[PDB]
Symmetry: C3
Subunit: 109 residues, 3 copies
């Protein structure tokens, strides 16, 4: 999967977490968010198509994706510990990380 | 997971996509198809057990698996865009790619 | 995801397999167990924080995680073949592998 398909996966799974009821649904959705990021970890946004891999603008995209996967992992642990509301609260703070990362590298759509 | 277990996962998830109702179920099943392929990306079919990795018959299996993951990624994006029928139509064309790849490297079962 | 979050994912998915009804639910949960292990394949338990990577105590943790992913893959194939009870029986023997691996490297909690 390319970049902007995994970003829409993240956004949609965040909507599943809000409408969740138990720890299984949120943990499942969170793992899908972790899954999507790893399959698209090596993907490239449409903006940074012709940018060099060693460019400061591209590596700043790589650390932001690594940061995104780091907040996902922390929310996964809270859901794995049976704390549904402590994780859903972390998924809300995660949403502002997915959103900021998305429009910064979106194709202006 | 070995090769023919992930191929049965693909086949079963295609059946889930036909019986889906919303974008969440098809996107989830599609990501499972992408998941299965990556975990079995380095797997080897029972036929090509003793074939050399640089053999033309083996590399042709590798590019076909890469092609399979490429059609999955495209169907994932259509489901991520909320187009359930545009993606289910792509999952049907994907089914003929999973089927052709399966029996070509199946253990004649 | 770190180590003890993926181990709780494994434990919770085993509980989903017991409460499953069809091949889709068990195969899905099993793939989540395979997923969790690959994302945490390079993770480090809290005990082995300061141990060297070439230490016998650390490599013994690596082969045990590889063994864990091997039993998961075999249970995935049984669920992929439509054998729900043959796989749920394998998931029960898998549970004693997840449990033994968990408390051996748990942070004494
Ligand atoms: Mn990987």
């Amino acid at each position: 999967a390319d970049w902007e398909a995994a970003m829409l996966t993240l956004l949609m799974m965040l909507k599943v977490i809000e409408k969740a009821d138990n720890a299984a649904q949120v943990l499942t959705a969170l793992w899908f968010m972790a899954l999507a990021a790893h399959m698209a970890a090596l993907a490239t946004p449409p903006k940074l198509e012709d940018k060099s891999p060693a460019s400061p603008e591209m590596i700043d995209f790589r650390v932001g994706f690594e940061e995104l996967a780091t907040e996902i992992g922390k929310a996964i642990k809270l859901a794995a510990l049976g704390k549904v509301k402590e994780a859903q609260a972390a998924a809300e703070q995660l949403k502002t990380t997915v959103n900021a990362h998305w429009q910064k590298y979106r194709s202006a759509e």
